[PDB]
Design a protein around this ligand. Structure first.
Ligand code: SF4
Lengths: 226, 118, 158, 45, 232, 124, 243, 184
DNA sequence: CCCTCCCCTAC
């Protein structure tokens, strides 16, 4: 909101904020609705305090209250405080938008493929004696782009699919995989097409934010301590 | 501002034991963040009874927002681009509490899209 | 040794000792160890009904303070008959002892080049059945045979 | 370097400008072209 | 209206007792965990111990106190030295002038008042000197106006429901005591002087609670020995 | 909710200036002590009424509330220093808050039952 | 070996409780919880299978044949190659039926019970006949009988957030349990398949081992996911979040 | 007045002696009945010896002490080490009563004193077996034969003419062994 | 209420 940095010229350039998942952390095996409601009201308070200044896009995560399969459906209109009714009226979706876990964002003409990282976190749970580092994760994302599918491990990533959206039909400009142990970026060229791959780290540990410049496709990092 | 921000800080610090943030002054007096930092600095002075623990943060060239804890050795002194009192704490543990803020006219950077009702 | 006092009188020695008490109790007709009979932790389950089976009466009680009899002196139970009479501004203490520091810390801390055997051979088969009918020797033929000889007891090393 | 020196070096000579708050600046308009385009491949019934 | 009043009182008492136990080293700090949900929404991130027996003990004590809150005008937690039975610190929750109405203050305002009161308690407790390990214990003392306890077992009544069993347990779980029973007997050789500190208290519409603390802060040798971690 | 209660609550609160809540009377006292500094000093009648209320509070075994009011007044006076210090109202307020208040803390050492053991050492 | 594993476990636990604690309150609470779980259906359904060896040619008449003989004969009627060996235990379960129906008339095989859409375990028959008599025989010598213990055992729509949270929690718990079961089965089937991707989950799902509790758990989880109540909950969720 | 005082003092002294006997090892556990008795409506278990002869001896001692209460100034149960004849521990009941007061006050005072005694005895270290002996000692003011410290004051009766004071003293070669007396 | 048949166990 420009209160901390106080450089209102540069802060105003951040048009939109994208939350890429894992907004709440809980164990489904032993959890009641009271604690989840408390955490959701905290999140709703943050959203209410920040929505008037910036637009926020919400993406489901693995431990978020959503289905365990990779094509997670958007957050329900409920599970939010009553103060967000105006934002949930239906007409004002440019301020608050709830989208699916894998989603293509056409931000000012720049296509952005974003996933909360269940695919990469799913390939990395195997032991493959033929090939955990930031470079290894970036290479895995490059391989996912090259193979033209987003979920190589179908039995582990996606559930029964009626009637496959994860087989790519078009290459995005930016590829985002979130909830990763480390932050890293790499520009790749597959068949003469340039794709920028970004690894978004968690905020609970290494509370770092990524600033993505849409004009030059350059990603700069902002860190918050305590 | 003068004789008003000081009274608000004194009340919110001693009458009710609650940490006082500069954003609280922003919401109360409807003033800019720089002015709020100035008033926090002004209240930090002319206080003989240091019954509060000031919380300060340092803004670096790499936008590394850091809470100062050691208060003796601050790494990368030449890299600090801004330093101010973030909050006033009457106790050792900070643990602030947040609620709904009716930011009707306290915004300094408003978003392009306006809210539509019905 | 602590002094008894300026003018102290001494009573007679107790009839029993540490080792003779249990033996004398057994001699008097009681068992040396009175093991606890089955009981109820709470008196809600007592049901206030006689417990009997096949003409044998069973006495089942509870260890709760509600069902525990008052201590009797001289064979007669001493109890309060009149209604309680209180006074204004009385202070009370909760009695029950909390867990100790050591208990909580302990809980936290934990959490022959001569053949004298018989050679052995095993066989299993696979037959391709039709629909779900179980393999039938008259209509279903054998498609695979698997044999495994026991190497531990097999001589001749061919 | 004492924190008092840093506080009196930064907060004392504050800018106190461009923060009138009467007419706050508009944030940069970033539009999602897929907002109403629909046809989401990952949308399941 | 006591359906919500009792819940708020239970939350406040749980937070109060857990804070006192945490900040006075009655139990090891590692067992305590900072949390917001402890079967109820707590006003802040109060540290609550994870020991099951301790949790059950605290819950039973709070329920017993609330069951007789009509006759109770003052509830106190006494800090007792283990080496010798003596109250070295006393924290008092004054329940006098508390409205007892069975007939709309909401929850946000009540929790704001609770946050202020608990913050005052924490600020007072932080300044106190540290306490060594396995040397202190706590006690619960209530000041009643018109009641008698330990006399409901004279009728030889048989309990038939859980409520009656709980009532008969709570009626006999307390022992009559005297005012300042655990304090030193004023030996006269540099007599100890009890020290009184006043704290903020919640003043919600139905809930008017005052709170203050007591401490010996003195002695005549053999008192407060090997319990306050020497100088610091 | 019973017969032994002296009011809607267990005990009857002492009313000062038609006020019952202790937070409300505390904030009223704070506002009065802030406003009376610029008036050259509080009126004698107001000080006498405050002293009478404090005496009533002490006689009712509410010395913790008296200590709370004393601490509030002392904190207000300390926070008012360096701006209105020695302004002909600060000195009189300090003299009153010492002479007519501090000795009053060491009286009426009763707890509805005889007298309290040991001696009082107030935080002040 | 003429009973069920559930009864063996229950009697062993009750006897151990009586011998160690000697408190009948714990035994009563445990028995009441077990009876409630049996009634509600939160049971393994592998611990409620009888297995008695049958001798098909050594019975006086069809009326005097055992309950397992009826199941074996039905399987033989459906396929003549399903003839059991001599003194071979034939597993079977009992199911709910009309009043006065003979015990041998229900006699559901585990294969038929699991594939049966509307087949329910006879909770009353099990709880009374298989549990009450042995417990009474062991406990009447004390003076108590377990029969009494056994015989003794709009607004939400307005609060959309709580209802949707409860529905989501239930659905997510079921989904996580099913995913864990599928992972376990895939790891088990890796022994034969030696593969980790697709065409190994298919083979893992093709398993129908009736000696594994994981198979019963997976079947129950699939039935729960495909049950009508789950459809009702999903429809209610859609209606609630249609605003 | 005196009637209720004596009526409840008999039971109080019986519980006193039985508790001291059981919580130390003058007589072994399993010789007491700690399950089917309650002392003064207290939530704690109270043990009573199962041997009628020892119970009769204790009751006769209590009656004899109460008979000469106007002349007896003190009454104590002395713990004596075998092979040393030294008083390791002592549990004294000082008497300052004067021979009005309702039965409820006496009952509550004795109940509180018994609770304090039980709490004190529960914290004491365990002593070994066949190394302890007890003796009833009385003191005259101004079956009876003429004859370092760690004081621990305990709450007695102070509800009027009853001014009974209760305290214990302490301080052996291998008698004490640290190790839950109800766990067997 | 009693009888017969079947299953399974203990020595
Ligand atoms: S069911 Fe039991 S056996 Fe069949 S696969 Fe799953 S685990 Fe392996």
């Amino acid at each position: 909101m420009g209160r901390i940095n106080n450089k209102i010229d540069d802060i105003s350039l951040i048009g939109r904020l994208l939350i890429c998942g894992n907004s709440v952390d809980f164990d489904i095996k032993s959890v009641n609705k009271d604690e989840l409601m408390i955490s959701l009201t905290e999140f709703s308070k943050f959203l209410h305090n920040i929505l008037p200044s910036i637009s926020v896009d919400i993406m489901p995560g693995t431990n978020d209250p959503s289905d365990k399969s990779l094509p997670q459906q958007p957050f329900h209109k409920s599970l939010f405080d009553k103060s967000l009714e105006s934002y949930f009226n239906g007409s004002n979706k440019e301020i608050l938008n709830l989208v699916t876990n894998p989603y293509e964002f056409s931000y000012n003409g720049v296509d952005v493929l974003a996933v909360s990282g269940k695919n990469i976190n799913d390939i990395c749970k195997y032991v493959i004696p033929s090939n955990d580092d930031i470079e290894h994760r970036l290479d895995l994302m490059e391989c996912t782009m090259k193979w033209q599918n987003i979920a190589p491990t179908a039995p582990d990533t996606l559930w029964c699919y009626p009637y496959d959206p994860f087989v790519l039909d078009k290459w995005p400009h930016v590829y985002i995989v979130a909830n990763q142990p480390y932050f890293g970026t790499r520009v790749v060229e597959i068949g003469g097409k340039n794709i920028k791959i970004i690894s978004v780290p968690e905020f609970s540990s290494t509370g770092m934010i990524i600033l993505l410049d849409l004009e030059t496709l350059e990603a700069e990092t902002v860190k918050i301590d305590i | 501002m003068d004789q008003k921000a000081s009274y608000f800080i004194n009340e919110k610090l001693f009458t009710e034991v609650k940490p006082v943030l500069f954003t609280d002054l922003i919401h109360h007096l409807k003033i800019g963040p720089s002015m709020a930092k100035k008033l926090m600095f002004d209240y930090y002075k002319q206080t003989t009874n240091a019954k509060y623990n000031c919380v300060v943060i340092c803004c670096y060239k790499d936008q590394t927002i850091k809470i100062i804890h050691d208060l003796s050795n601050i790494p990368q002194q030449d890299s600090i681009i801004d330093c101010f009192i973030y909050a006033f704490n009457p106790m050792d543990s900070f643990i602030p509490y947040y609620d709904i803020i009716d930011q009707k006219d306290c915004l300094t950077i408003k978003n392009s899209y306006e809210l539509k009702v019905s | 040794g602590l002094r008894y006092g300026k003018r102290a009188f001494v009573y007679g020695e107790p009839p029993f000792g540490y080792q003779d008490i249990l033996n004398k109790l057994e001699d008097e007709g009681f068992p040396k160890i009175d093991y606890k009979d089955p009981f109820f932790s709470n008196p809600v389950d007592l049901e206030n009904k006689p417990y009997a089976y096949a003409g044998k009466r069973f006495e089942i009680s509870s260890t709760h303070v509600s069902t525990r009899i008052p201590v009797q002196f001289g064979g007669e139970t001493v109890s309060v008959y009149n209604k309680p009479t209180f006074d204004m501004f009385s202070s009370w203490k909760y009695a029950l002892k909390p867990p100790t520091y050591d208990a909580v810390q302990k809980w936290y801390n934990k959490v022959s080049s001569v053949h004298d055997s018989l050679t052995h051979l095993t066989l299993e088969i696979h037959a391709n059945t039709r629909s779900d009918k179980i393999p039938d020797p008259a209509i279903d033929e054998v498609s695979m045979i698997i044999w495994c000889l026991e190497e531990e007891t097999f001589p001749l090393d061919l | 370097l004492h924190m008092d020196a840093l506080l009196t070096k930064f907060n004392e000579d504050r800018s106190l400008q461009d923060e009138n708050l009467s007419q706050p600046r508009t944030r940069v308009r970033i539009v999602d072209d897929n907002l109403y385009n629909k046809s989401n491949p990952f949308q399941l019934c | 209206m006591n359906r919500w009043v009792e819940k708020w009182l239970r939350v406040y008492l749980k937070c109060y007792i857990n804070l006192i136990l945490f900040y006075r080293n009655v139990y090891p700090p590692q067992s305590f965990d900072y949390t917001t949900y402890q079967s109820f929404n707590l006003p802040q991130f109060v540290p609550i111990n994870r020991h099951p027996a301790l949790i059950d003990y605290i819950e039973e004590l709070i329920l017993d106190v609330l069951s007789k809150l009509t006759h109770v005008y003052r509830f106190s937690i006494c800090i007792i030295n283990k080496k010798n039975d003596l109250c070295i610190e006393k924290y008092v929750l004054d329940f006098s002038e508390l409205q007892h109405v069975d007939k709309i203050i909401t929850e946000t305002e009540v929790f704001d008042e609770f946050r202020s009161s608990l913050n005052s308690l924490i600020m007072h407790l932080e300044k106190l000197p540290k306490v060594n390990d396995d040397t202190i214990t706590f006690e619960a003392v209530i000041n009643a106006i018109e009641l008698e306890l330990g006399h409901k077992l004279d009728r030889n009544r048989r309990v038939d429901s859980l409520e009656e069993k709980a009532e008969i347990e709570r009626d006999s779980n307390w022992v009559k005591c005297q005012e300042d029973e655990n304090l030193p007997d004023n030996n006269g050789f540099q007599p100890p002087k009890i020290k009184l500190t006043s704290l903020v208290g919640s003043d919600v519409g139905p809930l008017i609670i005052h709170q203050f603390s007591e401490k010996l802060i003195s002695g005549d040798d053999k008192i407060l020995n090997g319990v306050y971690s020497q100088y610091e | 909710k019973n017969h032994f209660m002296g009011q809607n609550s267990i005990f009857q609160p002492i009313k000062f200036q038609n006020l019952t809540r202790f937070k409300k009377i505390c904030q009223l006292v704070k506002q009065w002590v802030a406003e009376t500094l610029g008036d050259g000093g509080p009126h004698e009648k107001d000080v006498k009424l405050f002293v009478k209320y404090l005496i009533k509070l002490c006689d009712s075994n509410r010395v913790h509330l008296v200590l709370h009011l004393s601490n509030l007044i002392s904190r207000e006076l300390n926070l008012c220093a360096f701006l209105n210090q020695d302004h002909s109202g600060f000195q009189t307020w300090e003299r009153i808050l010492l002479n007519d208040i501090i000795p009053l803390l060491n009286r009426n050492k009763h707890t509805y039952q005889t007298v309290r053991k040991l001696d009082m050492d107030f935080e002040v | 070996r003429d009973g069920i594993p559930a009864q063996q476990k229950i009697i062993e636990k009750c006897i151990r409780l009586l011998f160690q604690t000697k408190d009948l309150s714990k035994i009563k609470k445990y028995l009441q919880n077990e009876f409630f779980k049996i009634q509600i259906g939160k049971v393994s359904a592998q611990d409620f299978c009888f297995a008695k060896e049958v001798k098909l040619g050594a019975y006086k008449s069809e009326k005097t044949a055992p309950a397992g003989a009826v199941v074996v004969k039905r399987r033989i009627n459906e396929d003549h190659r399903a003839e059991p060996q001599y003194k071979e235990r034939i597993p079977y379960l009992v199911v709910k039926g009309k009043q006065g129906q003979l015990l041998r008339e229900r006699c559901v095989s585990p294969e038929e019970f699991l594939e049966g859409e509307n087949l329910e375990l006879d909770s009353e028959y099990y709880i009374n006949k298989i549990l009450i008599p042995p417990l009474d025989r062991l406990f009447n010598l004390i003076g108590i009988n377990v029969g009494n213990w056994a015989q003794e055992i709009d607004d939400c729509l307005e609060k959309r957030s709580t209802t949707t949270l409860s529905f989501l929690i239930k659905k997510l718990k079921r989904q996580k349990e099913y995913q864990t079961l599928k992972t376990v089965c895939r790891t088990c089937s890796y022994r034969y398949t030696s593969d980790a991707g697709i065409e190994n989950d298919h083979i893992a799902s093709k398993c129908n081992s009736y000696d594994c509790p994981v198979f019963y758990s997976r079947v129950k989880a699939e039935r729960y996911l495909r049950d009508n109540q789950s459809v009702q909950r999903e429809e209610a969720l859609i209606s609630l979040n249609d605003w």
